[PDB]
Amino acid sequence: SGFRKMAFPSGKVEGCMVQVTCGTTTLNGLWLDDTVYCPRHVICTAEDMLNPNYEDLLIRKSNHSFLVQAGNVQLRVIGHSMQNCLLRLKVDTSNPKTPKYKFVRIQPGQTFSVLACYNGSPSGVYQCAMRPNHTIKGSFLNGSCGSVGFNIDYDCVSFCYMHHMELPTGVHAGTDLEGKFYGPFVDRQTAQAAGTDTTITLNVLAWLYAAVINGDRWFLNRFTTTLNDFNLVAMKYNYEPLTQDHVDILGPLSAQTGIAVLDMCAALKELLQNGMNGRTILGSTILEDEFTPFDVVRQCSGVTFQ
Amino acid sequence: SGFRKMAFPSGKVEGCMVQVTCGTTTLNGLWLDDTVYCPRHVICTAEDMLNPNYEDLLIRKSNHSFLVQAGNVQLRVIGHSMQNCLLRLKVDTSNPKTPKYKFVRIQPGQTFSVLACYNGSPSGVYQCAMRPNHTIKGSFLNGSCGSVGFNIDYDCVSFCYMHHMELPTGVHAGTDLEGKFYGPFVDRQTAQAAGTDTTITLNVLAWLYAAVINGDRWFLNRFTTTLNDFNLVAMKYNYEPLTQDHVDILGPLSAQTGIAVLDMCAALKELLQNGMNGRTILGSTILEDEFTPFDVVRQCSGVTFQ
Ligand SMILES: O=C(Cn1nnc2ccccc21)N(Cc1cccc(Cl)c1)c1ccc(-c2ccc[nH]c2=O)cc1
Ligand SMILES: O=C(Cn1nnc2ccccc21)N(Cc1cccc(Cl)c1)c1ccc(-c2ccc[nH]c2=O)cc1
Hints:
Two copies of one chain form a homodimer.
Chain A: H1 11-14, E1 17-22, E2 25-32, E3 35-39, H2 54-59, E4 66-70, E5 73-75, E6 77-83, E7 86-91, E8 100-103, E9 111-118, E10 121-129, E11 148-153, E12 156-166, E13 172-175, H3 201-213, H4 227-236, H5 244-249, H6 251-257, H7 261-274, H8 293-299
Bound molecules: ligand Y67 (2 copies).
Active site (chains A, B): 41 (for 3cl-pro activity), 145 (for 3cl-pro activity)
Subcellular location (chains A, B): Host cytoplasm; Host Golgi apparatus
Cytoplasmic side (chains A, B): 1-306
């Protein structure tokens, strides 16, 4: 029993974190096989951030413009290239701690673990969601750029995020491990801001199923809803519209608890309209949206507490 | 910016997790140097849990009654002894991944990271507090016994918890790494229940200082309080009494934000009496008590957003 915002064990990723220095500028990088990946803003001075031409900044560097430190070991850079908003540094040594890995581009609403790093040293791990507005509500200080997000499946690390920026509202923006930003953001100083965000409906439904699995039914009711009537309520409360694909994804949870998806939707409509009236769900007074249906199945018992 | 329930990176502990089997009974153990530590209930059948005499159950075992599996490697047991509610197994191999470590007995209100394990395989990591009632609000399923809690300080792992039991209210009980239970609990079937719990006052004050560091002052007020007048309010709301020692611990946070501790206490008295009136603090609608003053300093900027 219990339900916590659980991260994946971080060891497989800790063994891949290094420090990358170009002159006075330092941040973190990810060392897989004989390549180091890092934010391309490592080649900038603070003043270069105002309006950098990365092509122009990079052609002015050599291999030896870059220092890579792995623990107390200097790695020699033997090649370099830009890939979208990342630099790829070829190094003289393959990382002997390289796990089985993949690079994946996650979708909005999906969750991942972040390993917060400073100076190539891991400091902490926590679980995030990719918001609908393509930001993450992380916890990062200056020096955290190049920190990575990931999932683990059967000893394979799926890297999905590399940290680049804190936006003016204190949320975070970054790239996949091909250096494409999540959302409309750019690695230069502009008036860019986080767009309006929405609650991840699918995740709130998954977490209601988690509270039932764990033995709580108080918020259920005798009503059902149509998807259209649910979505008129969602629009009012700044919830993502629910789709048939979302209903289908909730099938396994529905089957484990014997609660039809649209009957769970009816419960959520009533929670949104009426509020929680001093009650909690899995220890929370608000409707949590940072657990996917997959996260609930990973963490909860396969046996409902009936 | 941001504030998250952050765990310590788990790698140093992942490298120490093994599986311990005595007949049909399996759980996790911790492999440091040439010793494996695990809950002594590994020597029980399910029926033995009703009223086990561990001295009597153990004298009936040999070294070869115990199988220890580290990945796909069988470790041979060459000695065994009971230490309070743990078994200590001597093995033929020193763990080459043993980190610098210590065993510490933490105090109520202090936090640690849990590495949830099944069959000697780590599955997840999350941060907990030791409740005043000597339980943790973990997330554990059957098979999780022998999972450990820890802190990390400068590459030294301080082990503080080993998982033994889920109590009837779905919270968790365990031991230090000398096998002494936290709280009044015993490793046998009794009517034992979690005692009444209280909110960790010190931690709520630390988290209010975190919200100020991160740039939020909305809940502050022009009042001050005495420690006695604060504690009459604490008694009413099931908060731990605040002590002078707690005031002294908050000195560094007070100094960083320029808010006197008793002025922060006055803010908390007003939040308890009036509620949050639809507002949030660091994204929360409730007063969070699972961050210590040390956790706030670790995670937050050394520079207040003034
Ligand atoms: O948000 C960042 C870096 N950040 N990432 N999480 C953070 C959390 C807290 C504080 C800062 C953080 N920005 C701003 C930015 C502006 C424009 C484009 C981008 Cl992509 C990022 C940043 C600021 C300074 C520098 C810099 C470059 C060269 C030498 N020295 C430096 O400081 C780099 C990035
Ligand atoms: O709470 C546990 C084991 N637990 N720990 N977190 C859990 C989370 C979810 C479910 C069970 C969990 N109890 C109960 C208990 C009773 C009396 C004393 C203690 Cl100390 C623990 C437990 C139940 C069964 C067995 C058992 C022993 C031998 C062979 N097979 C078995 O199943 C061991 C412990």
